[PDB]
């Protein structure tokens, strides 16, 4: 409705209606969905991904890293006024904004192996803070990185600091990334700070013809 394709996949709190959708025939998106990246930022190869959706008819959402499994990091403190759910300021439902526990931020080394039979859409992100101060306030370690690996992926992301105009009240930025993890293959993350980790990911349950229509209209009870 008022959600965007990004909003839906990342699971903006305002898009909860779409947390777990049944097979579809086409997707319909408004010209300017009100509920998109509540926390300002950017979605990498966003168009190339949308193109991938034009060939998919069904996701089944699965958990690949439980929120509860983050022992040596705060997972529940990862929330923002830029993403209100209902008063209580919130965050993207499908990814965790991990933050320092005690005074510290241990190197994360987590990996998921795709024991499923179908291709898997995996999402994650990086936080770009305002200054060294905020960097150090939230994560501890001042010089950070996120490394991600697949049989095909060789990514090392590095947070980028800069003073920027506020958007939805945040001068910070969030930058999300994605990959398709083939069956029997694994994805290995490693990070030391500014990591926005996966919780939920999407199985490509069936592939076929579809499209992303741009229409302001709503469902008509017809065929």
């Amino acid at each position, epitope marked *: 409705r008022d959600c965007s394709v990004a909003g839906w996949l990342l699971g903006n709190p305002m898009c909860d*209606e779409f947390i777990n959708v*049944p097979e579809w025939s086409y997707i319909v998106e408004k010209a300017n969905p009100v509920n998109d990246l509540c926390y300002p930022g950017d979605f990498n190869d966003y168009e190339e991904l949308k193109h991938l959706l034009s060939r998919i008819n069904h996701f089944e959402k699965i958990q690949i890293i439980p929120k509860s499994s983050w022992s040596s990091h705060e997972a529940s403190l990862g929330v923002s006024s830029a993403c209100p759910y209902q008063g209580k300021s919130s965050f993207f439902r499908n990814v965790v904004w991990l933050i320092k526990k005690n005074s510290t931020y241990p190197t994360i080394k987590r990996s998921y192996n795709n024991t499923n039979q179908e291709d898997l859409l995996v999402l994650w992100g990086i936080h770009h803070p305002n200054d060294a101060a905020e960097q150090t306030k939230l994560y501890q370690n001042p010089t950070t990185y996120i490394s991600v690996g697949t049989s095909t992926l060789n990514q090392r992301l590095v947070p980028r600091i800069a003073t920027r105009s506020k958007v939805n009240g945040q001068s910070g930025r969030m930058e999300f990334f994605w990959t398709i993890l083939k069956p029997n293959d694994a994805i290995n993350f490693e990070s030391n700070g500014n990591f926005i980790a996966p919780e939920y990911a999407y199985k490509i349950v069936k592939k076929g013809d579809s499209t992303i229509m741009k229409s302001e209209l*709503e469902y008509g009870n*017809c*065929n």
Partner: antibody
Amino acid sequence: EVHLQQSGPELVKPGASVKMSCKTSGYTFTEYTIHWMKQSHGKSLEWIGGIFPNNGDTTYNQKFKVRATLTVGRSSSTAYMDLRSLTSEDSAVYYCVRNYGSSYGYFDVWGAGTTVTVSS
Amino acid sequence: DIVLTQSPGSLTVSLGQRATISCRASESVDNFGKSFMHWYQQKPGQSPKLLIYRASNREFGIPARFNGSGSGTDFALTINPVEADDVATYFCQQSNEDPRTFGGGTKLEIKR
């Protein structure tokens, strides 16, 4: 969540009328047709009707055309059914159910069940 | 009316085995290339539950033990392996053509 909260169990004198309600919550009322199902105590499911909130179009079963009346309160996010001039026949359970898409759709979210008892 | 007739009426199957419930439609329920059949599960003492839509695909949060199969005039819900919490009456219902019609229903019992 997709919860459907419906009316509490009811008793009606034979010949009278009932109006059980079903309150929608958790999704957009106006995107899906709501329907009613009757189940003769531990036997078989019968389809009564359907109504699409957004404009109030109704679709009835032959059997219930007369005795039944689906209505919708858009501000209330609520669907109502009304059974007029009852008999022992109508003593059974009534489910307020959300059907997914149109004429060719599956009922995915079923409500609790308002159970009606017709006796003097 | 598309009369839906399920068979058998009652089925008792040993634990850890295969339950095989059938559905038969008076006329086809099968155009646009897809079957418009649905399976529903009513665990005792509560409202029915959605298992399979358009005869073959599982609704989210349904274990793989449920095999939706069939095309045209006859279908089959296959539960295998049968678990403990599978005592229920199972219903098939067609959406191909109003008025929406359901099956008689099949009650499943566990041999222990």
